Structures are given as C-alpha cells and as structure tokens.
Design a protein around this ligand. Sequence first.
Ligand code: F2R
Ligand code: MG
Ligand code: MG
Length: 326
Amino acid sequence: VSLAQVRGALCGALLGDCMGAEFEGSDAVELPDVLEFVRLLEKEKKAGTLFYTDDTAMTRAVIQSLIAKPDFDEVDMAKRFAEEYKKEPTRGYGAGVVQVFKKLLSPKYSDVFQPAREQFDGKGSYGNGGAMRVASIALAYPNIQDVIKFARRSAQLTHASPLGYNGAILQALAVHFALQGELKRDTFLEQLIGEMERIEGLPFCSRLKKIKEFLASSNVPKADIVDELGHGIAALESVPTAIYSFLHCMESDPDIPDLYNNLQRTIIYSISLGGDTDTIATMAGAIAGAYYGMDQVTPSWKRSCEAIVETEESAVKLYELYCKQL
Ligand SMILES: N=C(NCCC[C@H](N)C(=O)O)N[C@H]1O[C@H](COP(=O)(O)OP(=O)(O)OC[C@H]2O[C@@H](n3cnc4c(N)ncnc43)[C@H](O)[C@@H]2O)[C@@H](O)[C@H]1O
Ligand SMILES: [Mg+2]
Ligand SMILES: [Mg+2]
C-alpha cells in the first residue's frame, strides 16, 4: 500500500462529498447538470469554493481519533463526534443522529453505545452515516479482522441496527480490498461476497449478487440501478450503489467523456444517479481513490475543496499509522 493510495482515498472522499453536496436529495439531477457543474468548477478562479458536509466533518473526527488513539478508542471517537456536532451543527446531519450527539454531550450516559441503541424505538438507525465516514478504518488497519471489528464499533456509536453497521463494514471492506494492488473486478466482488456471507450469515449479499449480474450486462439504464440497488439515505440503498459505481467506472461509460479519468468518471457517474449524492459519491470516491491513487486526483478538481490541504496532511498521518501497524 502506497502513500498515493491513502491520499487518493481521502481526497476522493472529499471530492465526492464536496461535489455531490449541491445535488443531494435532488429529484431533478441528471448527467447534463453534473457535466456542466464540472466544466464550470474547473474554470473557477478562486480555490475552495465547495464546502464539505457532515460526511467529511465526521470523517475528520474519525481520523483525528485514529491519530490520537491508534489502538482504537471508541470513547475518544464518540467525544469527537459529539463535539464536532456541537461546534458546526449545520454541516448537514441526519434528523435522527442529532439526538445521539445530544445524549453523548449530556451527563446521563456512561455507555457511549447506548444512545445509538435507543434510536428509532430501540431498533437503531439503518442510515448510511456509519458508512459515510468509515473509509479511514481501512486506511489505518492492514489486518482485515481489525477493519471489520473497528468499522462495526465506529458505526455502532450512531448506528445500532445491523443494516447500519453491516453497511459500514461493507464500505470499509470495499476500501480495504481496493487498497490491495489493483484487483480485477471479479476478484474484488468475490472478496466482498465472501466476507459479507460470513458476516451476515442476507440483504447486503443479495445486492452484491445483483451487482455481479449488472456488471455482466451492457448499457444498464440509471433507472434499473436506482430501482434495484437504490440511491437512498439507508445504508442498504447506498453502500452497494457506491460499490457498483466504482466497479462500473473501471471501464468507459458512453455518456461520460473519456477525457475524465476513472476516479473523475466514478464521481460524475455517482452524482448522476441522484438521491443521496454526496454520500454515494463520497463512498464511491473513497473506494476509487484507494484503487487508482492520488495520480487521478487532479489539481483543478482538488483545489475546489474546502480543507484539501488539511486532508492531504491527514492522509500522510494515516499512512504512517498503517505502516507502523505492519
Ligand atoms: N442528512 C442529510 N441530508 C438531508 C438534508 C440536510 C439539511 N441540508 C440539513 O442541514 O438539515 N445527509 C447526511 O445524512 C445522511 C446519513 O444520515 P445518518 O445515517 O447519519 O442519519 P440518521 O441515523 O438520522 O438516519 C437518516 C434517516 O434515515 C431514516 N431512518 C434510519 N433508520 C431508521 C429506522 N430504523 N426507522 C425509520 N427511519 C429510519 C430516518 O428518516 C432518519 O432521519 C447522509 O446522506 C449525509 O450526507
Ligand atoms: Mg452530507
Ligand atoms: Mg448524503
């Protein structure tokens, strides 16, 4: 695993969040809007015109916890989540998860997992908020067993439903396997299916099997992807879609100009799917970034993003943590 890959993953996550943010929840977004957006963005004279959202706010909190406590400290991490919320509450947090932060900030809970368990009448959140921030677990911990147990724990601080935390594990594993050289598309899916069959044993495996079917077809319409995989706030309806976006964009897409590289193509395609665009693109962007590396994060794109320099600095620190774990 190279510095290029860790850098790529975090910068890809940042780009996906920043670029996807203006379209999130849009019923009307289609590819022409996204292509226009990109060509305008590339000519913007001022840097830093795209602000990040909760997806990145929580990512940065995860990273600062991993650097402060590299053996993984869920109490430290919970505190950083709640304090980040308190400091910048308008970044775009889910309507449910705010109550978790409020309870963590209160004196009443000793068990930092207990607020999450109380969400949605004790069923817990099945939102994608655990998955949107989880990439860095795969960037800090080379051992897959660590990736799984820490992805799960980091997610369970807000997402107590298995759909929520298994979605976070799935996203962490997709980044993990993308880091392993440049696996062939079919090997990558086989790796993910193998792991999720064990973990769920099966909603996420079902979606991964559909993905295998889609990848074996040609010219699959957006509507079929949306209808079968989803583009929603639920982890089940967003994490597989992000994985699909990444795997699809390993090859040319006839509607996206081939002057865009694979990572750019992945982000554009993700956003073009509509729905939860900042989170699907932040997840697909983390996976693509880990896979292709920083070579595909172009200067005109990355300069557009709030906190790019801090993000690059944090990628160097995560890389050193990863190397130390070896
Ligand atoms: N929240 C948004 N965007 C909405 C607009 C934001 C607006 N601009 C603002 O500033 O307020 N995006 C971000 O949140 C998503 C991830 O949310 P997370 O999973 O962290 O949130 P939460 O746990 O609150 O769940 C989200 C919603 O899912 C439904 N839900 C979840 N579990 C449920 C359950 N067991 N039963 C019923 N409903 C459940 C609820 O509708 C929750 O409010 C990302 O997209 C991020 O970008
Ligand atoms: Mg957001
Ligand atoms: Mg979102």
